[PDB]
Amino acid sequence: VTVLVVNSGSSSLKYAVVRPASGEFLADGIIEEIGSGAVPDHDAALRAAFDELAAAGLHLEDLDLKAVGHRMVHGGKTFYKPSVVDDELIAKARELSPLAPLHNPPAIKGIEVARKLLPDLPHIAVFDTAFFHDLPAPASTYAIDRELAETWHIKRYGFHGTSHEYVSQQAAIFLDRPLESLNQIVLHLGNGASASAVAGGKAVDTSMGLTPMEGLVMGTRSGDIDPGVIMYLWRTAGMSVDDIESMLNRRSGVLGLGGASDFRKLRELIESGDEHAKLAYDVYIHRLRKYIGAYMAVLGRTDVISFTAGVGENVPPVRRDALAGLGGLGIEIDDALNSAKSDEPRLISTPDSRVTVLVVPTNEELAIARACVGV
Amino acid sequence: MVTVLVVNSGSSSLKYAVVRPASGEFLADGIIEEIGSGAVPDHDAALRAAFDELAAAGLHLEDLDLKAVGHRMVHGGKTFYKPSVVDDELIAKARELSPLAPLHNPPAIKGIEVARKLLPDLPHIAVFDTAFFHDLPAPASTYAIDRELAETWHIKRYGFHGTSHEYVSQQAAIFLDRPLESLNQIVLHLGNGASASAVAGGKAVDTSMGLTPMEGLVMGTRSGDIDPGVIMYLWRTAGMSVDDIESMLNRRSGVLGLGGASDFRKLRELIESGDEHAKLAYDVYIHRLRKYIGAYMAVLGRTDVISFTAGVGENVPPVRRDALAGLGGLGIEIDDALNSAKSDEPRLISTPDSRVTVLVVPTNEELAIARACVGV
Ligand SMILES: Nc1ncnc2c1ncn2[C@@H]1O[C@H](COP(=O)(O)O)[C@@H](O)[C@H]1O
Ligand SMILES: Nc1ncnc2c1ncn2[C@@H]1O[C@H](COP(=O)(O)O)[C@@H](O)[C@H]1O
């Protein structure tokens, strides 16, 4: 079986052609700077991905393509399992776009162009929420008016579920220990950033909320913030609710506080003596330390902590700084291991660390491909 | 001996005490409740009623060496945090800030206003919930939002319940006969409002409430922590005004909104009767509390002591048990017998094997206010 995988984000479109059984990748790539002269919209972007495949000597028509898998961030209550795309599903994803305004809209546009180019294949949506569907009620229920919550279906959905799931599975395998025997924390530190607590393979907590706005500090998102700040910006700073949301999603996190377009730039700013960048980094780490401790308490016993996604996989100082000074919680980083140049699943804790600490790279494309099978 | 009158004016109640700060002796104490209608329509009427109770109990303030009247003020923003003699400037600032602490700043201002009419010739002193947290480290008090917008509008984590967090951290050190500066501590103020703090060698390094008392733990009627996306959704889709969302989060949330219980005693009674909603609310409350305890253990790195205080913290053994159960891996073990035995004294509730020492350390809030008035 062969699958085309599309992850259509606001600014870029990631694609791969994958054989899920073997895991082999026949091609992968990223079309960047959507809105450029060359790639002005998502429709241009998928067409360009097709040109790159062709340029590589890959012709989809000769491949056994059985499905096209898409990342969708929010499906609300109705859609969370891998689902065959139809007009119904697209209508619901559109309805829910305001719950995930940075992700659902370009995902839908990715679907729209893909269904035009490949109208006779099944298109399958794979949802970020799926892994968290069975979160325990005490972890997913906000402490608000119960009638109100249930009336509007307010609960913690959680996101990055395919990464948290994949990484928790792969950490067990790396340790050659049964998934069901392990209590784990997974730290998905990318443009979006989320933590999960996984107890014997089952998600028991995660940091994002009804929407991807809750939790860790992110690239442009605030994460956790006092609800009073929102009320004050509305009441006293005179900002509209939409403008406050926009600020929290797009002019917050490392960018808003630190001035950095992405995490590589931030670390460069810090290296150049920029105090604002250093504060934004320290705020990011302080938040991350708090989620790690919080989730150790949720689990009771913690066997494994794994770092993943762009920052988690590639920035040793984040991993060091997140875990520094936690000998009394059973955690000790091996600095030589942590600093190793490597892209492989790997150990970063010392032999005497009671908690095992890993880097376990995410593979969204493989996860989506496998989730298409059988649907 | 020097005597202080303490006024602690909340949304629907006014707590009063006449206290000797040196000995800690209370000459009188009481609470006026159900303020807002009937015989006690407002806080002016409430303090007058307090004075009637003092007289009925045989207390005559004019016979006392009353040196000051102390008032709890929750928010003074940037300008007022130290214990401060009340003047019009301070009142005007507290009034300006009232929407940041709508359950607390307005009734406290009203209490000052009547107190100054009844006792014009005494200094009235404001004691602020934020003081203990004034010097929080910037990485703990700076929200990850647009830096320039935050700076312009003075947005940062202030923290509240400071007098209790301060008092308990001091008293935990004294109880353990160890220097205050040697200890890393967590304090859990579990009352109608609820907040946690992390204290390193006497200095606060983190706390759970925010710019406002709305952030952090689950509380009596307050939500504490919530996805900002929920607020946006309630506005956009449920058609609620921002003021009404705020009111819901402050007044119809927490154990009440979720559990249908007017207070924690009632909540436990419902649970014992088999009320599934009340049980889920308790489990949400404990889940959140556990997360803050774990979080602040990571902030401190090494934690020497965890102390419970305030109404629930002092009086509800199951909360202390459930908040800390299954944490042997983090060096914590509760002694169930010590935890269950009734006492009103500062006391140990952890086993000798527990690496982290666990205490119950009661706070008398009125006593703390009276003490802060001395030497202002
Ligand atoms: N080698 C690297 N060094 C620093 N940051 C990186 C590196 N690789 C990826 N990132 C960051 O990870 C984020 C993207 O992660 P993701 O969303 O998982 O693709 C961006 O902020 C990138 O700058
Ligand atoms: N003995 C008790 N048993 C259960 N809850 C109590 C007890 N005493 C006080 N509380 C609760 O503590 C909360 C108020 O604490 P505070 O704000 O410190 O007065 C209320 O929910 C009370 O019902």
Side-chain angles (χ1 to χ4, degrees), chain A residues 311-334:
Chain A
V311 177
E313 295 169 25
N314 299 302
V315 182
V318 167
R319 300 189 296 251
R320 173 171 347 118
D321 294 339
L323 295 176
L326 306 183
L329 306 185
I331 297 167
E332 186 182 36
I333 290 282
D334 180 314

mmCIF file of all heavy atoms in Angstrom, chain A residues 311-334:
data_model
loop_
_atom_site.group_PDB
_atom_site.id
_atom_site.type_symbol
_atom_site.label_atom_id
_atom_site.label_comp_id
_atom_site.label_asym_id
_atom_site.label_seq_id
_atom_site.Cartn_x
_atom_site.Cartn_y
_atom_site.Cartn_z
ATOM 1 N N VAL A 311 12.289 21.845 18.209
ATOM 2 C CA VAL A 311 13.146 22.267 19.293
ATOM 3 C C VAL A 311 13.581 21.092 20.147
ATOM 4 O O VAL A 311 14.754 20.984 20.487
ATOM 5 C CB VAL A 311 12.424 23.306 20.161
ATOM 6 C CG1 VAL A 311 13.295 23.707 21.341
ATOM 7 C CG2 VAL A 311 12.055 24.514 19.313
ATOM 8 N N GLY A 312 12.652 20.204 20.495
ATOM 9 C CA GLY A 312 12.974 19.071 21.364
ATOM 10 C C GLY A 312 14.058 18.180 20.770
ATOM 11 O O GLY A 312 14.903 17.670 21.474
ATOM 12 N N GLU A 313 14.027 18.019 19.453
ATOM 13 C CA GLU A 313 14.955 17.114 18.778
ATOM 14 C C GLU A 313 16.343 17.730 18.573
ATOM 15 O O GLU A 313 17.336 16.988 18.493
ATOM 16 C CB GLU A 313 14.369 16.661 17.432
ATOM 17 C CG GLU A 313 13.109 15.820 17.577
ATOM 18 C CD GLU A 313 12.372 15.576 16.274
ATOM 19 O OE1 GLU A 313 12.970 15.620 15.156
ATOM 20 O OE2 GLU A 313 11.170 15.308 16.335
ATOM 21 N N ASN A 314 16.427 19.061 18.524
ATOM 22 C CA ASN A 314 17.614 19.742 17.998
ATOM 23 C C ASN A 314 18.285 20.760 18.877
ATOM 24 O O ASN A 314 19.293 21.360 18.470
ATOM 25 C CB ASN A 314 17.246 20.410 16.679
ATOM 26 C CG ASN A 314 16.803 19.406 15.645
ATOM 27 O OD1 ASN A 314 17.553 18.491 15.317
ATOM 28 N ND2 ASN A 314 15.585 19.535 15.163
ATOM 29 N N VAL A 315 17.749 21.012 20.062
ATOM 30 C CA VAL A 315 18.307 22.090 20.878
ATOM 31 C C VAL A 315 18.690 21.584 22.245
ATOM 32 O O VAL A 315 17.866 21.593 23.159
ATOM 33 C CB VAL A 315 17.341 23.262 20.961
ATOM 34 C CG1 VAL A 315 17.947 24.409 21.761
ATOM 35 C CG2 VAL A 315 17.010 23.734 19.559
ATOM 36 N N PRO A 316 19.942 21.115 22.408
ATOM 37 C CA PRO A 316 20.338 20.549 23.700
ATOM 38 C C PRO A 316 20.097 21.447 24.918
ATOM 39 O O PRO A 316 19.670 20.952 25.948
ATOM 40 C CB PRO A 316 21.833 20.293 23.534
ATOM 41 C CG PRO A 316 21.956 19.973 22.101
ATOM 42 C CD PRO A 316 20.974 20.839 21.377
ATOM 43 N N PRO A 317 20.360 22.755 24.797
ATOM 44 C CA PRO A 317 20.171 23.603 25.983
ATOM 45 C C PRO A 317 18.746 23.619 26.541
ATOM 46 O O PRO A 317 18.581 23.685 27.760
ATOM 47 C CB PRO A 317 20.571 24.980 25.484
ATOM 48 C CG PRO A 317 21.605 24.685 24.447
ATOM 49 C CD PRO A 317 20.983 23.522 23.701
ATOM 50 N N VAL A 318 17.743 23.540 25.679
ATOM 51 C CA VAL A 318 16.355 23.432 26.153
ATOM 52 C C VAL A 318 16.178 22.213 27.047
ATOM 53 O O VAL A 318 15.547 22.300 28.090
ATOM 54 C CB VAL A 318 15.342 23.405 25.004
ATOM 55 C CG1 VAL A 318 13.949 22.979 25.485
ATOM 56 C CG2 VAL A 318 15.279 24.770 24.353
ATOM 57 N N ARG A 319 16.749 21.090 26.641
ATOM 58 C CA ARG A 319 16.547 19.816 27.365
ATOM 59 C C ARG A 319 17.293 19.868 28.697
ATOM 60 O O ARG A 319 16.804 19.429 29.732
ATOM 61 C CB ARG A 319 17.006 18.645 26.472
ATOM 62 C CG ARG A 319 16.241 18.555 25.175
ATOM 63 C CD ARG A 319 16.535 17.284 24.411
ATOM 64 N NE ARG A 319 17.937 17.214 23.999
ATOM 65 C CZ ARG A 319 18.394 17.332 22.752
ATOM 66 N NH1 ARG A 319 17.578 17.551 21.725
ATOM 67 N NH2 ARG A 319 19.711 17.215 22.523
ATOM 68 N N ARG A 320 18.508 20.418 28.655
ATOM 69 C CA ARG A 320 19.329 20.622 29.832
ATOM 70 C C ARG A 320 18.626 21.527 30.841
ATOM 71 O O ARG A 320 18.520 21.189 32.032
ATOM 72 C CB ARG A 320 20.666 21.281 29.447
ATOM 73 C CG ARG A 320 21.539 21.694 30.630
ATOM 74 C CD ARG A 320 22.921 22.114 30.141
ATOM 75 N NE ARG A 320 23.112 21.708 28.748
ATOM 76 C CZ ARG A 320 23.331 22.529 27.710
ATOM 77 N NH1 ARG A 320 23.434 23.847 27.869
ATOM 78 N NH2 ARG A 320 23.444 22.016 26.492
ATOM 79 N N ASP A 321 18.186 22.674 30.346
ATOM 80 C CA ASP A 321 17.604 23.718 31.172
ATOM 81 C C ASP A 321 16.237 23.352 31.728
ATOM 82 O O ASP A 321 15.927 23.716 32.874
ATOM 83 C CB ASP A 321 17.538 25.053 30.411
ATOM 84 C CG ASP A 321 18.922 25.626 30.093
ATOM 85 O OD1 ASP A 321 19.930 25.248 30.756
ATOM 86 O OD2 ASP A 321 19.027 26.437 29.143
ATOM 87 N N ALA A 322 15.441 22.639 30.938
ATOM 88 C CA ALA A 322 14.151 22.101 31.401
ATOM 89 C C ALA A 322 14.306 21.179 32.624
ATOM 90 O O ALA A 322 13.395 21.072 33.428
ATOM 91 C CB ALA A 322 13.452 21.331 30.286
ATOM 92 N N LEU A 323 15.432 20.490 32.718
ATOM 93 C CA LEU A 323 15.603 19.407 33.692
ATOM 94 C C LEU A 323 16.698 19.668 34.696
ATOM 95 O O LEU A 323 16.969 18.820 35.546
ATOM 96 C CB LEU A 323 15.845 18.104 32.954
ATOM 97 C CG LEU A 323 14.657 17.646 32.109
ATOM 98 C CD1 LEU A 323 15.042 16.400 31.337
ATOM 99 C CD2 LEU A 323 13.436 17.420 32.965
ATOM 100 N N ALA A 324 17.293 20.841 34.653
ATOM 101 C CA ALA A 324 18.399 21.149 35.564
ATOM 102 C C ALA A 324 17.953 21.202 37.011
ATOM 103 O O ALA A 324 16.874 21.696 37.329
ATOM 104 C CB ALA A 324 19.053 22.472 35.159
ATOM 105 N N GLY A 325 18.784 20.716 37.930
ATOM 106 C CA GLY A 325 18.463 20.857 39.332
ATOM 107 C C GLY A 325 17.383 19.929 39.867
ATOM 108 O O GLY A 325 16.898 20.177 40.968
ATOM 109 N N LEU A 326 17.052 18.856 39.136
ATOM 110 C CA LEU A 326 15.945 17.952 39.506
ATOM 111 C C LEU A 326 16.418 16.585 39.994
ATOM 112 O O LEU A 326 15.686 15.597 39.941
ATOM 113 C CB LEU A 326 14.946 17.813 38.353
ATOM 114 C CG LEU A 326 14.389 19.121 37.804
ATOM 115 C CD1 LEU A 326 13.346 18.829 36.715
ATOM 116 C CD2 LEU A 326 13.782 19.999 38.893
ATOM 117 N N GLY A 327 17.647 16.531 40.501
ATOM 118 C CA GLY A 327 18.139 15.326 41.134
ATOM 119 C C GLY A 327 17.174 14.755 42.159
ATOM 120 O O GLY A 327 16.985 13.543 42.212
ATOM 121 N N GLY A 328 16.541 15.628 42.933
ATOM 122 C CA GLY A 328 15.582 15.230 43.962
ATOM 123 C C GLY A 328 14.257 14.708 43.451
ATOM 124 O O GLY A 328 13.453 14.163 44.230
ATOM 125 N N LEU A 329 14.013 14.885 42.156
ATOM 126 C CA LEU A 329 12.897 14.237 41.488
ATOM 127 C C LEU A 329 13.349 13.014 40.684
ATOM 128 O O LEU A 329 12.561 12.456 39.957
ATOM 129 C CB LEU A 329 12.168 15.230 40.590
ATOM 130 C CG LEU A 329 11.682 16.547 41.223
ATOM 131 C CD1 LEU A 329 10.885 17.331 40.205
ATOM 132 C CD2 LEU A 329 10.844 16.266 42.444
ATOM 133 N N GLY A 330 14.612 12.595 40.827
ATOM 134 C CA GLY A 330 15.091 11.412 40.149
ATOM 135 C C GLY A 330 15.579 11.588 38.716
ATOM 136 O O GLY A 330 15.662 10.617 37.976
ATOM 137 N N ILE A 331 15.940 12.819 38.344
ATOM 138 C CA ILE A 331 16.313 13.154 36.971
ATOM 139 C C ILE A 331 17.721 13.714 36.918
ATOM 140 O O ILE A 331 18.060 14.623 37.640
ATOM 141 C CB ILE A 331 15.361 14.216 36.376
ATOM 142 C CG1 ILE A 331 13.934 13.667 36.296
ATOM 143 C CG2 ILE A 331 15.847 14.654 35.006
ATOM 144 C CD1 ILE A 331 12.882 14.713 36.029
ATOM 145 N N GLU A 332 18.536 13.153 36.045
ATOM 146 C CA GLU A 332 19.879 13.675 35.818
ATOM 147 C C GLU A 332 20.236 13.537 34.351
ATOM 148 O O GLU A 332 20.261 12.431 33.805
ATOM 149 C CB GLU A 332 20.915 12.940 36.671
ATOM 150 C CG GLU A 332 22.305 13.549 36.565
ATOM 151 C CD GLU A 332 23.347 12.797 37.377
ATOM 152 O OE1 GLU A 332 23.278 11.551 37.460
ATOM 153 O OE2 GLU A 332 24.246 13.463 37.928
ATOM 154 N N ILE A 333 20.491 14.679 33.722
ATOM 155 C CA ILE A 333 20.991 14.733 32.348
ATOM 156 C C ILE A 333 22.485 14.432 32.269
ATOM 157 O O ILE A 333 23.259 14.915 33.082
ATOM 158 C CB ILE A 333 20.706 16.118 31.705
ATOM 159 C CG1 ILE A 333 19.203 16.283 31.448
ATOM 160 C CG2 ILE A 333 21.504 16.314 30.423
ATOM 161 C CD1 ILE A 333 18.687 15.559 30.220
ATOM 162 N N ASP A 334 22.846 13.604 31.282
ATOM 163 C CA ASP A 334 24.242 13.355 30.882
ATOM 164 C C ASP A 334 24.556 14.401 29.816
ATOM 165 O O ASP A 334 24.012 14.377 28.720
ATOM 166 C CB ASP A 334 24.365 11.927 30.352
ATOM 167 C CG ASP A 334 25.791 11.547 29.898
ATOM 168 O OD1 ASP A 334 26.472 12.308 29.178
ATOM 169 O OD2 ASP A 334 26.181 10.406 30.193
#
